[PDB]
A paper describes a structure:
Facilitated by the icosahedral symmetry of the capsid, it was reconstructed at 2.9 Å resolution. Although one of the vertices of the capsid is occupied by the portal complex, icosahedral symmetry was applied to maximize resolution. Consistent with structures of the closely related T5 phage, the T = 13 icosahedral capsid of mature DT57C was composed of two proteins, the major capsid protein (MCP) and the head decorating protein (DCP), and it had a diameter of 930 nm. The asymmetric unit comprises 13 copies of the MCP lacking the Δ-domain (the first 160 N-terminal residues, which is cleaved during the maturation process of the capsid). While one of them is located at an icosahedral vertex and contributes to the formation of pentamers, the remaining 12 form two consecutive proximal and distal hexamers. We observed clear additional map features located at the center of each hexamer, corresponding to the decoration protein. The strongest part of the electron potential map was found at the binding pocket in the center of each hexamer, corresponding to the N-terminal domain. The center of both hexamers, located below the map feature corresponding to the N-terminal domain of DCP, was predicted to be highly negatively charged.
The T5 family of viruses are tailed bacteriophages characterized by a long non-contractile tail. The bacteriophage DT57C is closely related to the paradigmal T5 phage, though it recognizes a different receptor (BtuB) and features highly divergent lateral tail fibers (LTF). We present a composite map determined by electron cryo-microscopy (cryo-EM) at resolutions ranging between 2.9 Å to 4.9 Å of the entire T5-like phage particle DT57C, and atomic models comprising its core structural proteins.
Residue numbers in the entry:
A (entry chain E): 162 to 204
B (entry chain F): 205 to 457
C (entry chain A): 307 to 457
D (entry chain A): 205 to 255
E (entry chain H): 256 to 306
Write the structure that this text describes.
Amino acid sequence: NQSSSVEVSSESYETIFSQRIIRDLQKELVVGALFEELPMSSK
Amino acid sequence: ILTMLVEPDAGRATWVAASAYGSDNTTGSEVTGALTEIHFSTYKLAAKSFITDETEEDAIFSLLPLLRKRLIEAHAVSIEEAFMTGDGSGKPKGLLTLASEDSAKVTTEAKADGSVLVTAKTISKLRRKLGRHGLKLSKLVLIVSMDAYYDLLEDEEWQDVAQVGNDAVKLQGQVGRIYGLPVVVSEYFPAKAAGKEFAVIVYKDNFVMPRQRAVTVERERQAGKQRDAYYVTQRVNLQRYFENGVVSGAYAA
Amino acid sequence: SAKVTTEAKADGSVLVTAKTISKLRRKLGRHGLKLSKLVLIVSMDAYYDLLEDEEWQDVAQVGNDAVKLQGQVGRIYGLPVVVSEYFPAKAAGKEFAVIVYKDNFVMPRQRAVTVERERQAGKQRDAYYVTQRVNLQRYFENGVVSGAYAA
Amino acid sequence: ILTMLVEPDAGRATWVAASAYGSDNTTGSEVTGALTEIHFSTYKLAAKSFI
Amino acid sequence: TDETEEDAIFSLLPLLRKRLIEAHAVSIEEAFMTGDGSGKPKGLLTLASED
């Protein structure tokens, strides 16, 4: 703040750190799971 | 200051050759990813006004409620103006400034004189530059200047019943939803001039309003002046999460 | 300066289209947004020109209220229409339509219409007197817009 | 004559800089406003006829 | 200022009071040590000098 008579050590003590993680929009997946599956038990 | 964490982008696996079925390459490559962070802050807006002790008697009626309501409405007006088109110098950055600095300010073809009006098609074309976030209409907000609204009222594409249902202009004289977007009119857009803006579309969920202190009123008595001073203060700002979600249509040059 | 010089020609080369009338709402500014607080008045010649509008003929154009089916123009662009014959004579730079914010105008009045009958025996006449005291005033210096012919 | 009071327009507060936080400018600027009046009047309309 | 107490995780008042009190104590001891006579008490060093 650096405006009153007394000041804090640095901006680390003027800050609140949050453990919240947020993500943007991700491309939707379409072809990954639209076909039927053919299981195998050999090469 | 408040700081939050932002989850990084996406990696990918690898296809291993059959020859490496026994070597160390059978497990493919290594994925890596580093977090990031974002910050928030606030600005202080304030105003003051004094009333001397000679005027309350020197009047047939009181003059205090007028003073209080004028202070409040001045605060609100300044907030709205700054949020609309404020700069970054000691004030919140306006939506138009964000669009300009994001290169999302689209130069349209409408002229500043009237040679080309503002059409519904031009407004709807802006959804392209929003990329992924433009695919959902329910998460969008459209705001148009007054002149833009009056230009839309004369749009040739919303005139007849055959064209647009029963919501044709000729039957109503007003424009509600446009291309699936609701219309909200604002008067705080800049002046009608070349290169200036007339509309903006905002991803509503991407914008927050940080606030430290709400509207407060501090009254002070000054006996040596025989005045009553009134002080109104608050600390607000307008911040977003990621550099996207805002596109603004502008006039031609 | 609410006198919009429209492109309609008094000589009659170009008629007075409906779009021309609706464009006048732009000049009203903040008061022109809400439709229910407006009144539209047009001259008789303007009304007959409205009846010859290409844009109000077909059913597919304007619902059931096409001119070809009725012959009277009612609401125009959401504005009900009223015809008055007290406009000036059709000439260059003359008004044919008026849009007015209704509540901006008031009618002050001191005394109503009164009739006084006097018997003048020195002249064998009965004098009849009719008097009233009124005016037309508006609150704020706005609220009315009128369009005029070209040239 | 009838006289009516007209309320004036709106003011605007100020964004105080961080440097002036401890000074008197932290209170911002002052907003003023003067009332106004509007007057109404009338006219007389008269006509006469004899028999 | 009022825009510092909110602008910090922890209060800063006890520090202020302590600093003021200790400023008084340091100043008074220094003055009694070698305070001159001009607006301040004469210090023992000054007294011994003048005698």
